Design a protein around this nucleic acid. Structure first.
Ligand SMILES: Nc1ncnc2c1ncn2[C@@H]1O[C@H](CSCC[C@H](N)C(=O)O)[C@@H](O)[C@H]1O
Length: 388
DNA sequence: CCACATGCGCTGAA
DNA sequence: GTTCAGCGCATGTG
């Protein structure tokens, strides 16, 4: 029939917001979504990716595949030979083995080359690390010389350069999608970002940059992210694809209240010691009030009203600990609620929870690293493919 | 200079 | 090596 098979390759895959968004819109597009491959080295993300996206996977105690050597328990550092031994002969090893075998996980982007990068990819995503780009962090940036984690962007450059020479034009990925944080468009980062856009044109791609807020895509979260959607020059001509004006999109509001889960056994914060003020609403529809003498870290010092939207969920720190005011008291958004906040489903969260391998704080960590799924649904909805 | 808005962060002690 | 409570300022707009 006219079912189009869509082969997706996810670099820096995390828990697969990209794959989730494609499977969500697939039926409406008459698409069949297929794993071409992925690159993710973070043990908790990989386990969780498998939990969320597997069909009929049955975990068991297994030896770790002998070439699974570049993986990380914290997402920043490679695991030692000893840490690898500790994963060997466990249920967790089976998740890592399954990711390799069934999802074609290549684990470490540095280990990706023209000899293992799949041909004929329809959608190639690269949500590269934001650490050195985020305004919340130290802003070391992405200068090539510095070899930073956000600088792993230049590994994507390497890969494209390599495959350009060995692949036919038609074997090159059809669509590319970058995601990163808003500070990528800062004055200090523009030089590097512009250098990247010029390389993409060098590689035969036509691109558009979008700065999109999750709050405009049916979410109760202020989260501004930069996307660079690219289309291969010739495929643009063959399809007649045109870039949509996604920055003009505004959907109906959603409030924090709309995703909250009722419980009788929540832990409430004792804030009796701290002076406070009326709630105040900013232009963005964040309704918040400060806690005085709480900490010296600004972003930690706010309680949010559930009748507005909330702040960007971060993996760690202040914005991973989102305090909301409810009738029963002030509490943090829970891991379930953080999954819902990134527009994953309750069933997605239950699958990760049921693995019994991911702590509550690690579940928030991987949610905070992710992308709100309906932003991606909106972007992927604009894509065109040539009829079979 | 100011007031305001906002953050897929970092790390050392236990 | 883990883990997370305690910790600040960058990058804006007006
Ligand atoms: N050398 C490397 N190889 C593969 N993955 C890497 C890497 N360095 C960092 N990463 C991963 O890149 C990710 C950036 S966050 C991306 C999250 C993803 N878009 C999602 O849906 O959740 C992190 O999960 C981090 O573990």
């Amino acid at each position: 029939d006219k079912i189009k098979v869509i082969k997706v390759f996810e670099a820096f895959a995390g828990i697969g917001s990209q794959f989730k968004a494609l499977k969500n819109i697939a039926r409406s597009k008459n698409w069949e979504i297929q794993h071409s491959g992925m690159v993710e080295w973070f043990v908790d993300a990989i386990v969780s990716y498998v939990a969320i996206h597997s069909k009929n996977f049955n975990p068991k105690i297994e030896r770790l595949d002998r070439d699974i050597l570049s993986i990380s328990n914290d997402s920043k550092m490679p695991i030692s030979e000893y840490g690898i031994k500790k994963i060997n002969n466990t249920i967790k090893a089976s998740y890592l083995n399954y990711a390799k075998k069934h999802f074609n996980n290549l684990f470490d982007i540095k280990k990706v080359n023209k000899d293992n990068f799949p041909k004929n990819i329809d959608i190639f995503t690269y949500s590269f690390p934001c650490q050195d780009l985020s305004v919340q962090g130290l802003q070391k940036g992405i200068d090539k010389e510095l070899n930073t984690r956000s600088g792993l962007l230049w590994e994507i450059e390497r890969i494209l350069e390599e495959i350009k020479n060995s692949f036919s034009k038609e074997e090159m990925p059809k669509y590319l999608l970058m995601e990163n944080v808003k500070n990528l468009l800062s004055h200090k980062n523009k030089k590097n970002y512009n250098t990247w856009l010029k390389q993409l044109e060098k590689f035969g791609y036509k691109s558009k940059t979008y700065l999109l807020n999750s709050k405009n895509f049916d979410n109760c979260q202020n989260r501004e992210r930069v996307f660079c959607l690219s289309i291969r020059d010739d495929y643009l001509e063959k399809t007649g694809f045109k870039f949509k004006e996604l920055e003009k999109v505004k959907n109906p509001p959603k409030k924090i209240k709309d995703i909250l889960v009722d419980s009788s056994n929540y832990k409430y914060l004792n804030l009796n010691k701290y002076e406070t003020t009326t709630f105040r609403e900013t232009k963005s529809n964040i309704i918040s009030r400060p806690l005085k003498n709480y900490t010296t870290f600004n972003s930690e010092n706010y309680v949010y009203n559930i009748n507005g939207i909330g702040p960007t969920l971060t993996a760690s720190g202040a914005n991973s600990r989102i305090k909301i005011e409810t009738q029963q008291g002030v509490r943090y958004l829970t891991p379930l609620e953080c999954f819902k906040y990134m527009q994953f489903d309750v069933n997605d969260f239950k699958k990760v929870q049921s693995t019994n391998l991911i702590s509550e704080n690690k579940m928030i960590y991987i949610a905070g690293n992710s992308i709100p799924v309906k932003i991606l649904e909106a972007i992927f909805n604009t894509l065109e493919f040539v009829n079979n």
